[PDB]
Amino acid sequence: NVAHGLAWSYYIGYLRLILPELQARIRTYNQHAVSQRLYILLPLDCGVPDNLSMADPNIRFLDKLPQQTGDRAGIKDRVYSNSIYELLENGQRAGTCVLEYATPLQTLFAMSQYSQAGFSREDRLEQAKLFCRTLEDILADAPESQNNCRLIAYQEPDDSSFSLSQEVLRHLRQEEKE
Amino acid sequence: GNFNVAHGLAWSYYIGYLRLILPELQARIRTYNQHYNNLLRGAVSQRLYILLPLDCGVPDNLSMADPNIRFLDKLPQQTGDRAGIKDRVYSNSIYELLENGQRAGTCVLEYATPLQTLFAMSQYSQAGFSREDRLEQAKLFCRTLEDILADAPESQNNCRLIAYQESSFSLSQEVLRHLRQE
Ligand SMILES: Nc1nc2c(ncn2[C@@H]2O[C@@H]3COP(=O)(O)O[C@H]4[C@@H](O)[C@H](n5cc(-c6ccccc6)c6c(N)ncnc65)O[C@@H]4COP(=O)(O)O[C@@H]2[C@@H]3O)c(=O)[nH]1
């Protein structure tokens, strides 16, 4: 139940507002190069650094997209912002895409840290998996949504085996095979 | 069941919004009044007023909800690098409350956005929630929020919840009764 409202929160409050307009934001920037899907990272351990360079230094910030505004909930001119990132291979750019973590997992982490929330670390992993499931299902019955974005769910055990940069690039190159 | 959904959303609203803005809020307001509002009976108040309509009916534009609520200006914006999003923007709007053709108050006013999700979830088949579910959920959302705020280090007389059931009714009047109470 907890993760269910979180998943609908994410779609209703954010994904259904911005995705419909994402290509126009790209085409604006691209013409005056970046892939036209939003890449959303879903780390099941819910460990989410505000800076991606923390998760892999081969992930460097490049630019912001043009902002988007909605008047919503009686707040005037609410701003939706996204960041473009380069992904490095042997010190040199290999890819470019719009990239971010799903914020609702950062909420799930903090709830596990605060006593009044009554939420164990075991609860957090199950709610994380649940969150991923629900979001995936919502995004299937909404093709106008799925076709503008790509989800990546994964799990880490300190495993020096794992490069977030390499995994994204694996997904980027595999899109180019279509 | 209807507890855990509501519970979840209340924590989300604290973690991801309230605990980040409530601390700076009074500085933001104070700056606004000193430099841009030398109206002696027309200052902005020091609390954020959060409308909690219990049917989860949330329009996007507060002005169309009631004509005695007029948009005036925005506080200076607050930004944070969040989850890989460089420069996320938290923003708040100042509204004038009109009564008997006069100005009766000025405050920072908004709906609790999470209520929009409770509505949708009771409209979409896939979510599987009734209207009665939504009403139970909205009640528990307010209760959990109150509990959270009563123990929160960021809440320091810098917040007020306004819950109401929702013709003849007037939103501004409702907000004015809370303003006057202080
Ligand atoms: N009043 C107000 N509330 C805010 C604000 N930011 C967050 N919250 C509320 O706090 C709770 C926990 O927030 P998150 O943990 O960040 O989850 C979000 C988030 O990943 C994604 N998203 C929501 C907003 C956005 C913008 C304006 C108003 C409300 C929300 C948003 C954004 N501009 N930029 C990038 N992602 C965003 O959609 C999920 C559901 O969002 P909401 O249901 O609409 O409201 C949230 C939520 O209920 C704000 O500026 N103003």
Numbering used by the authors:
A (entry chain B): 154 to 185, 193 to 317, 319 to 339
B (entry chain A): 151 to 316, 321 to 336
What is the paper's account of this structure, in its own sentences?
The cyclic GMP–AMP synthase (cGAS)–stimulator of interferon genes (STING) pathway is an important player in detecting damage-associated (DAMPs) and pathogen-associated molecular patterns (PAMPs).1−4 Upon dsDNA detection in cytosol, cGAS synthetizes a STING ligand 2′3′-cGAMP (1a, cyclic [G(2′,5′)pA(3′,5′)p] with mixed 2′–5′ and 3′–5′ phosphodiester linkages). To understand the interactions of large moieties in position 7 of 7-deazaadenine in 2′3′-cGARMPs, we crystallized human wild-type STING truncated to residues 140–379 in complexes with 5f, 5k, 5l, and 5m using our improved STING crystallization protocols. The binding site is formed at the interface of two STING monomers and is covered by two “lids” (residues 227–241).
After proving that there might be space for the introduction of larger substituents in the binding site of STING, we introduced phenyl (5f), small heterocycles (5n, 5o), and pent-1-ynyl (5e) into position 7 of 7-deazaadenine. Surprisingly, we found that ΔTm for 5f, 5n, and 5o decreased by less than 3 °C, and EC50 values in the digitonin assay for these compounds did not increase by more than 2-fold compared to 5c. Moreover, for compounds 5f, 5n, and 5o, we observed restored activity in the standard assay, which was deteriorated for 5c and 5d. We also solved the crystallographic structure for 5f in complex with STING. Considering the structure of 5f, we hypothesized that there exists a possibility of intramolecular stabilization through π–π stacking between phenyl and guanine at 5f that might help to improve its activity. The main difference between the binding of the 5f molecule and the binding of the natural ligand 2′3′-cGAMP that we observed is the interaction of 5f with Tyr240. By modifying 7-deazaadenine with phenyl, we displaced Arg238 from chain B; we also brought additional intramolecular stabilization of the ligand conformation through cation−π stacking of the phenyl moiety with guanosine on the opposite side of the molecule.
